[PDB]
């Protein structure tokens, strides 16, 4: 069995300016099989109201997902995405960097 | 959605017959031909989905997707090919649309015609007199009786396998006192040399 | 118009964990999902508004019935593969079919299967044959090719039926599929690199590359992926490393929807 | 190995009566269908079952309902029978539905006739007529004729028996019955059949000939109020021996 680990990318919908309303995205793609758990983190804490698209299919038989929440970037707040998969020994955390 | 095929076709034993089928459908996923003998179940004959001609034994089927047109070609016809031939097209949603069917009638090749009208023996358990028109060539047509108390059946082809022999026949009967075999098939156009054996 | 594509995916899971469905089917036009069905809802439902508004309920009723049968047919096929692989546990079985209507009017058609996310069977509609990757797929290939009418059926569906559905769906959602939102392109610096960033563009097909003094730098360029912004537009970037000892004329080039764009770094 | 089996082969029904047609298949197929066939129309789907555990309406579902009992069985149900439902009903099956070039496998067929009242059902009168002596001397062949007259509805099966065994060689039974009174819509029917044998076979005095007609009519549960005998399902025959 060839199990493929998820590629994780965190980014804002628009170019983020502090105080200006925006959207934080976590795009998880290229993984197989399809079971996956994704969480958005603010200062290390899980965000309650998080939205996500349906499981999507790629031509190379891998799957992709988009997790997003509405937020307003500040200078103090730190954001990250936490992904767990069968190919991950422990959950992997990817911090938002701008 | 629309599919059409002729109601009925008549050809001669040993000849070739081409049964047409045209369809107007939204989308096309294949055309089926089925054979249905009288009183029995339809059975699968052929399938076409790409253009061209597919040959299989005495039968072959053609398809033209652009013209929305298919035909079933029957070669070297035999009496056992007498049946209805049903056309069916699978549309864009994989639903079958069925044509009304084409009844194929095969006229047998009578080698030695011997047309005659016979008086059959009365049955002591019936009041009817029975006349048998038999052994006539396939070009002869039998007309239904113009009289209300006289009953005439259409022609029927029987095959005696032991003698490799085929003959047409029609039956007329009535309980009328004036009924006679000399006049039973008067409303039909029978051969000139039809044998009428003398009565008693 | 631009190149457009239609494709349907199927996914089957042999021993799924509790809650997760063992069968899923999703249709796409370009990158937009249009249809969905799974073994939990047992209903085929639209995934796009311009699909729900233009297709009558009798359409969703009919294909719901088809997919309930195909769900069972997919379960049967996966049982057969996993038995002949002598594989235990939970394994996946996938199918993709579809077609492309290219810009110049030509068309393509494809149909292929996968086991555990790896190629399994690939159909060649021009030779009317199946490509098998191993001896379990070679057994399926001989059975599918013995039914010559099934190969002919798929060739007609890929070349005629699939294209006709694609044209129909293209008209239903032309306000979405045939629009153009040109990109917003900028450059900035970030051990020093130049980042060419684009965002707010649709369709998601875009070409971004760096040029040094007029020659391409394909080996030294770093390409970021094309990512969804979440509002129907996309974003991407491409970086390159700066030479600290010599100055060069770096210029970013962006191609999108028939319009070429150049940003010279001063 | 049995194919598609559906029962009953014939049935008479009074308006408003309940009826259920059975259909089974031992081919391990997944899709099953119920069709009705009418003169001048192509087959019209009533209900279909894409696989075990799902059914859906066809083109003419009103007045019917179905139950996919299991993988093998798919039964058609008439709640309140109506004259418009008089038809031949065919059940079919395919390996899968919507999966390519799969053909249909049909059952033998079920002939339903729905009447307002049973007071016009009649069994056939059967009589055998012996060959003409003129035919024997002119053609050296002998044609017997069997007439089944006065029956209604057209639920008959005619067969010839020679020396106790059913024969098919030399037989021509009419493919379609004859309306005794073509004007009326409820006319009783007539049917003719011929058996032609060699003159030498007819002239053996110990050859036994018999035509018998199987008629499908009323059953024990059908109410009968007429003066004549109840036209139950029955076999009517007539015989003749060879003459030297
Ligand atoms: Ca109903
Ligand atoms: Cl699909």
Angstrom distances, CA of residue C193 to CA of A14, C239, D234: 22, 7, 100
Neighbours of C44 (CB within 10 A): 21
D114 CB contacts (<8 Å, ≥6 apart)? Answer: D13, D14, D15, D17, D81, D82, D83, D85, D86
Residues D79 and D187 in one domain: no
- HEC string of D25-89 equals ECCCCCEEEEEEECCCCCCEEEEEEEECCEEEECCCCCCCEEECCCCCECEEEECCCCHHHCEEE
The two structure tokens encoding residue B102: 């084409």
Tokens 């235990």, residue located: C88
Copy the structure tokens of residue D240.
């003749």
**Who's near C250: CB < 8 A, 6+ residues apart?**
C194, C210, C211, C212, C240, C242, C264, C265
Classify burial at C93, counting beta carbons within 10 Å of its beta carbon; exposed 0-12, middle 13-18, buried 19 or more.
Answer: buried
Q: Which domain holds residue B143?
A: 109-200
Surrounding ion ligand 2 within 5 Å at CB are: C 8, 25
Looking at the structure, tell me whether residues B118 and B188 fall in a common domain.
yes
Instruction: Say how many Å lie between the CA of residue B44 and the centre of ligand 1.
Output: 29
D8 preceded by a cis bond (ω within 30 of 0): yes
Asked if B13 and B82 touch (Cβ cutoff 8 Å), the reply is no
Q: What CATH number is given to the structural domain containing A43?
A: 2.60.40.10
Last residue in a domain, options B108, B143, B178: B108
D90 & D189 share domain? no
- Does residue D179 share a domain with residue D121? yes
Question: CA-CA distance, D61 to D46, in Å (whole number)?
Answer: 5
Q: For residue A79, what are the domain limits?
A: 1-98
Same domain, D21 and D101: yes
Q: Which chains sit next to C, with 3 or more Cβ pairs under 8 A? A: A, B, D
Number of domains composing chain B: 2
Instruction: Note the CATH architecture for domain C2-179.
Output: 2-Layer Sandwich (3.30)
CB neighbours (10 Å) of residue D87?
20
Whether domain C180-265 has CATH 2.60.40.1180: the reply is no
Question: Could you give the 3-state DSSP secondary structure of residue A83?
Answer: strand
Give me the number of domains chain D comprises. 2
Question: Mutate which of D45, D47, D68, D101 to test chain C, going by most C C-beta atoms within 10 A?
Answer: D101
Whether D77 and D173 map to the same domain: the answer is no
Token couple for B94: 């994989």
Specify the resolution in Å.
2.4
Q: Which two tokens stand for residue D88?
A: 């031949």
Last residue of a domain, one of B50, B79, B108: B108
Farthest CA pair distance, chain B: 71
Residue D107 sits in the same domain as residue D174: no
For chain A, the domain total comes to: 1
> Strand, helix or coil at D214?
strand
Mention every residue, 6+ apart, whose C-beta is less than 8 A from residue D231: D118, D121, D122, D123, D215, D217, D218
Together in a domain, B132 and B101 = no
- Rounded distance between C-alpha atoms, residue C209 and residue C226, angstroms: 13
Chain D residues with CB inside 8 Å of B154's CB? 174, 176
Structure tokens at D77: 């149900």
* Residues in contact with B90: Cβ distance below 8 Å, sequence separation at least 6, in sequence order: B28, B29, B30, B31, B32, B96, B97
d(CA C13, CA A34): 10
Tokens of B91: 């549309």
Domain co-membership, D141 together with D232? yes
Looking only at the bridges linking them, the beta strands covering C250-256 and C227-228 are unpaired
- C62 assigned to a ligand binding site: no
CATH number of the domain where residue D61 is located: 2.60.40.10
Is the domain of B91 the same as that of B148?
A: no
Show the domain range for D70. Answer: 1-116
Are residue D3 and residue D88 in the same domain, yes or no?
Answer: yes
Helix (H) or strand (E) holding C156: helix C148-156
CB atoms near residue D228 (< 10 Å): 9
CA of D63 to the centre of ligand 1 (A): 5
Cα angle A79, A80, A83; round to 5: 160
Tell the burial category of C12 from Cβ atoms under 10 Å away from its Cβ (0-12, 13-18, 19+). buried
* Two structure tokens written together for D72: 């093998």
Question: Exposed e or buried b for every residue in B12-25, given b needs 16+ CB within 10 A?
Answer: ebeeebebebbbeb
Whether residues B2 and B96 share a domain: the answer is: yes
**Spatial distance between the Cα atoms of D106 and D58, rounded to a whole number of angstroms:** 17
> In chain C, where does the domain assigned CATH 2.60.40.10 lie?
180-265
Residue at which a domain ends, from B108, B138, B155 = B108
Residue C59 C-alpha, separation from nearest chain D C-alpha, in angstroms: 13
Torsions phi, psi for B114 (to 5 deg): -155, 60
């Amino acid at each position: 069995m060839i199990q493929r680990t998820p590629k994780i990318q965190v980014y804002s919908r628009h170019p983020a300016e502090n105080g200006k309303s925006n959207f934080l995205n976590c795009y998880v793609s290229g993984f197989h099989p399809s079971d996956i758990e994704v969480d958005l983190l603010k200062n290390g804490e899980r965000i309650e109201k998080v939205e996500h698209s349906d499981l999507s299919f790629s031509k190379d038989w891998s799957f992709y997902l988009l997790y997003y929440t509405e937020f307003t970037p500040t200078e103090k707040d730190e954001y990250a995405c936490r992904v767990n998969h069968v190919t991950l020994s422990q959950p992997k955390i990817v911090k938002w960097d701008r | 959605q629309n599919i059409d095929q002729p109601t009925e076709m008549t050809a001669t034993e040993g000849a070739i017959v081409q049964i047409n089928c045209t369809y107007q459908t939204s989308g096309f996923n294949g055309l089926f031909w089925y054979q249905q003998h009288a009183g029995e179940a339809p059975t699968f004959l052929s399938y076409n989905v790409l253009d061209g001609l597919e040959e299989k034994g005495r039968f072959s089927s053609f398809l033209s997707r652009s013209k929305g047109y298919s035909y079933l070609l029957l070669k070297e016809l035999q009496m056992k090919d007498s049946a209805s031939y049903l056309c069916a097209v699978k549309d864009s949603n994989y639903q079958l649309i069925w044509g009304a069917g084409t009844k194929l009638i095969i006229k047998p090749d009578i080698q030695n015609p011997d047309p005659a009208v016979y008086q059959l023996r009365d049955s002591k358990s019936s009041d009817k007199s029975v006349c048998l028109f038999t052994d006539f060539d396939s070009q002869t047509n039998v007309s239904q009786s113009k009289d209300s108390d006289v009953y005439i059946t259409d022609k029927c082809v029987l095959d005696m396998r032991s003698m490799d022999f085929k003959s047409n026949s029609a039956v007329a009967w009535s309980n009328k006192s004036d009924f006679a075999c000399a006049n039973a098939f008067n409303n039909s156009i029978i051969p000139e040399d039809t044998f009428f054996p003398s009565p008693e | 118009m631009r190149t457009h594509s239609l494709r349907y995916f199927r996914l089957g899971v042999s021993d799924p964990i509790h809650g997760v469905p063992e069968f899923i089917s999703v249709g796409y036009v370009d990158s937009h999902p249009i249809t969905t069905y799974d073994s939990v809802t047992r209903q085929k439902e639209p995934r796009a508004p311009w699909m729900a508004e233009n297709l009558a309920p009798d359409h969703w009723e009919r294909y719901t019935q088809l997919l309930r049968g195909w769900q069972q047919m997919f379960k049967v096929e996966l049982k057969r593969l996993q038995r002949h692989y002598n594989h235990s546990g939970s394994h996946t079985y996938q199918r993709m079919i579809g077609c492309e209507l290219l810009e110049d009017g030509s068309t393509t058609g494809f149909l292929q299967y996968a086991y555990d996310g790896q190629d399994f069977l690939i159909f060649n509609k021009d030779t009317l044959s199946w490509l098998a990757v191993d001896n379990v797929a070679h057994t399926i290939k001989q059975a599918w090719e013995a039914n010559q009418h099934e190969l002919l059926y798929q060739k007609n569906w890929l070349e005629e039926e699939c294209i006709a559905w694609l044209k129909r769906f293209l008209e239903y959602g032309k306000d979405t599929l045939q629009r153009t939102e040109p990109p917003l392109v900028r450059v900035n610096r970030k051990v020093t690199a130049l980042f060419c960033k684009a965002h707010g563009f649709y369709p998601p097909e875009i070409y971004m590359t760096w040029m040094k003094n007029g020659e391409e730098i394909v080996q030294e360029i770093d390409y970021g992926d094309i990512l969804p912004s979440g509002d129907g537009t996309y974003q991407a970037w491409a970086s390159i490393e700066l030479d600290p000892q010599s100055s060069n004329l770096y210029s970013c080039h962006v191609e999108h929807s028939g319009v070429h764009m150049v940003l010279q770094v001063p | 190995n049995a194919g598609v089996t559906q029962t009953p082969k014939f049935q008479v029904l009074k308006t408003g009566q309940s009826m259920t047609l059975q259909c089974a298949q031992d081919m391990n197929h997944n899709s099953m269908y119920w069709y009705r066939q009418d003169p001048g129309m192509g087959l019209r789907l009533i209900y279909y079952s894409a696989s075990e555990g799902t059914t859906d309406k066809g083109e003419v579902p009103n007045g019917y309902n179905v139950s996919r009992l299991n993988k093998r069985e798919f039964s058609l149900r008439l709640e309140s029978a109506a004259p418009s439902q008089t038809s031949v009903y065919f059940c079919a099956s395919s390996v899968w539905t919507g999966e390519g070039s799969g053909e249909l496998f049909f059952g033998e067929g079920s002939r339903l006739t729905v009447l307002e009242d049973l007071k016009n059902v009649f069994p056939p009168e059967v009589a055998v007529f012996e060959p003409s002596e003129a035919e024997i001397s002119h053609t050296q062949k002998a044609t017997l004729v069997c007439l089944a007259t006065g029956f209604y509805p057209d639920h008959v099966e005619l067969s010839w028996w020679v020396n106790g065994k059913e024969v098919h060689s030399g037989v021509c039974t009419d493919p379609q019955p004859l309306k005794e009174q073509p004007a009326l819509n409820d006319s009783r029917y007539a049917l003719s059949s011929r058996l032609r044998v060699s003159a030498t076979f007819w002239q053996n005095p110990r050859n036994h000939f018999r035509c018998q007609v199987q008629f499908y009519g009323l059953s024990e549960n059908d109410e009968w109020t007429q003066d004549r005998a109840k036209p139950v399902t029955q076999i009517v025959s007539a015989e003749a021996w060879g003459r030297a």
